[PDB]
Design an enzyme around this catalytic site. Structure first.
Site: not given
Ligand SMILES: [Zn+2]
Ligand SMILES: [Zn+2]
Ligand SMILES: [Zn+2]
Length: 502
Positions: A367, A481
């Site tokens: 990421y 999450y």
DNA sequence: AGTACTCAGCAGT
DNA sequence: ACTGCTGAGTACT
């Protein structure tokens, strides 16, 4: 049902976790006394460990029809996985059967390319019976059961394995559950031993989720009319990442592509301690490696590059380490080594998928974005949408479990959380790589792992996505999450709170 | 409790 | 590519 799905998934995760553990223990031993090369079956030992702790599913029964929790398109590497799940009991044989009345009918078949099966259509399959290969095939056991299945009209689970060459690039995508079939007719024919062979025609039952190889097919052929761009990286990636859409003429959203992390100006340069190894860094070597010692005295990777287990932090060999780039402690720094593409989704905006099977434990991508003190969600643009709160928290319960399986010993329970002083976040709203397009899911096939090379600041690690499933080709890549570490997801996928700390 | 069976998975060549 | 070998689990004597 959902509850069943999670039991299956976690069972396979456990199994492969144990496999890679046994493998790491062997890679830790020197070349000369490694069991690998000398007849080592990690599948058998992993299996035995799971069975010892009562981890098999549907133990002591045959399942006819649908095994709860097993879905069409699910992938396996070992025939043994089928056994622990109850999908297919025999370790080797193609035909599994059970009592259905006084007669016996086929529960499941495996078409691995051992005989001359014909799997030419999506719809219909021709399956060779099993018999010595010189006598004529006999209509007993499996062959008889597949014959009886025709009268009884009882469905058969079909697993197709890819043709196994010992070229053996990998075991990724070795078996696919294709689903439920009816046996329609069977005949005798001469098979290439000069002796007679049985043949069975099976037809896929309608209304099933469609075959995955048919989807690599629909996808595959060059024309790719869905193409929006050939390379979203615009050359910054050793391989192009293409963008496709067959639901619109929507161009992918606009952003500056980046492969390197943008630190702020104030974030101190902190070079890290490095190793002095001439060769590749392994536990096997006589000389100790500083980066190994940093990882707690264990290579957190298998030699093929798979992450062994999740960890709070993984330390890779840095730029000022003296080891070759082929060092096993270099994996995520080497960048993307999978064919990735971004695609439009009906529901979910834009997503990321892979057009080949991804073995469990594989590195996906980083990421990448620009790194910000969590204080600055002041920006207002990348609200959630292209934002990644760097994971601070950790729980040693899973390691406690793996530990219990392998040794019978656990460390005491401990949990960690980053001080609120410094949380950091990665904004990709303006600049980022392919990782910015990965969507979120309540049942993810990816998890985020913190790796440190380049520097030692543990509050700004790199976020490297790894795979926690054998992921079918084209299946969407998603991660869950962050969570509060007091809360956990149960079988039905609902948030509850963890049991007593003790 | 013993034996026959095998659509794996290795390993040597 | 072609061999040969040791097999886990299950069904039968
Ligand atoms: Zn190294
Ligand atoms: Zn080293
Ligand atoms: Zn090093």
């Amino acid at each position: 049902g959902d509850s069943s799905r999670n039991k299956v998934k976690e069972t396979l995760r456990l199994f492969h976790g144990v496999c890679r553990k046994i493998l790491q223990e062997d890679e830790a031993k020197p070349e000369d006394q490694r069991r690998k090369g000398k007849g080592l079956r990690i599948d058998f030992e992993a299996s035995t460990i799971l069975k010892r702790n009562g981890k098999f599913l549907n133990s002591g029964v045959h399942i006819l029809g649908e095994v709860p929790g097993v879905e069409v398109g699910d992938e396996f590497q070992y025939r043994m996985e089928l056994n622990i799940l109850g999908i297919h009991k025999p370790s080797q044989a193609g035909i599994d059967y059970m009592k259905y009345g006084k007669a016996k009918v086929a529960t499941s078949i495996v078409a691995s390319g051992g005989y001359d099966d014909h799997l030419d259509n999506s719809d219909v399959l021709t399956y060779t019976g099993q018999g010595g290969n010189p006598e004529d095939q006999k209509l007993i056991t499996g062959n008889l059961a597949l014959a009886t299945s025709i009268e009884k009209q009882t469905p058969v689970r079909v697993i197709r394995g890819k043709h196994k060459s010992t070229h053996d690039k990998s075991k990724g995508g070795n078996y696919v559950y294709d689903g439920l079939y009816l046996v329609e007719k069977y005949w005798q024919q001469v098979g290439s031993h000069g002796m007679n062979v049985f043949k069975f025609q099976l037809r896929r039952i309608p209304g099933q989720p469609e075959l995955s190889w048919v989807e690599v097919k629909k996808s595959k052929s060059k024309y790719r009319e869905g193409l929006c761009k050939l390379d979203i990286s615009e050359g910054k990636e050793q391989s192009p990442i293409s963008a496709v859409n067959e639901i619109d003429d929507e161009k992918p959203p606009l952003f500056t592509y980046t492969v390197k992390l943008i630190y702020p100006d104030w974030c101190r340069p902190v070079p890290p301690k490095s190793c002095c190894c001439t060769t590749r860094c392994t536990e096997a070597e006589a000389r100790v490696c500083a980066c190994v010692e940093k990882n707690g005295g264990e290579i957190p990777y298998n030699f093929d590059g798979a992450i062994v287990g999740a960890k709070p932090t993984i330390y890779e060999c840095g730029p000022l380490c003296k080891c070759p780039s082929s060092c096993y402690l270099r994996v995520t720094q080497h960048g993307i080594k999978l064919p990735l593409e971004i695609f439009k989704t009906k529901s979910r905006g834009w997503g990321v998928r892979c057009l080949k099977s991804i073995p469990i434990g594989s590195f996906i991508c980083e990421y990448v974005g620009e790194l910000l003190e969590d204080s600055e969600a002041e920006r207002r643009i990348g609200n959630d949408e292209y934002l990644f709160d760097i994971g601070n928290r950790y729980d040693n319960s899973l390691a406690q479990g793996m530990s219990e399986l392998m040794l019978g010993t656990q460390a005491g329970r401990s949990m960690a959380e980053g001080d609120e002083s410094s949380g950091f976040t990665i904004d990709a709203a303006s600049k980022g790589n392919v990782g910015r397009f990965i969507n979120h899911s309540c049942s993810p096939n990816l998890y985020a792992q913190n790796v440190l090379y380049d520097h030692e600041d543990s509050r700004i690690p790199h976020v490297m996505f790894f795979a926690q499933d054998n992921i079918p080709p084209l299946q969407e890549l998603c991660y869950d999450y962050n969570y509060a570490l007091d809360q956990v997801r149960d079988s039905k996928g609902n948030i509850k709170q963890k049991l007593c700390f003790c």
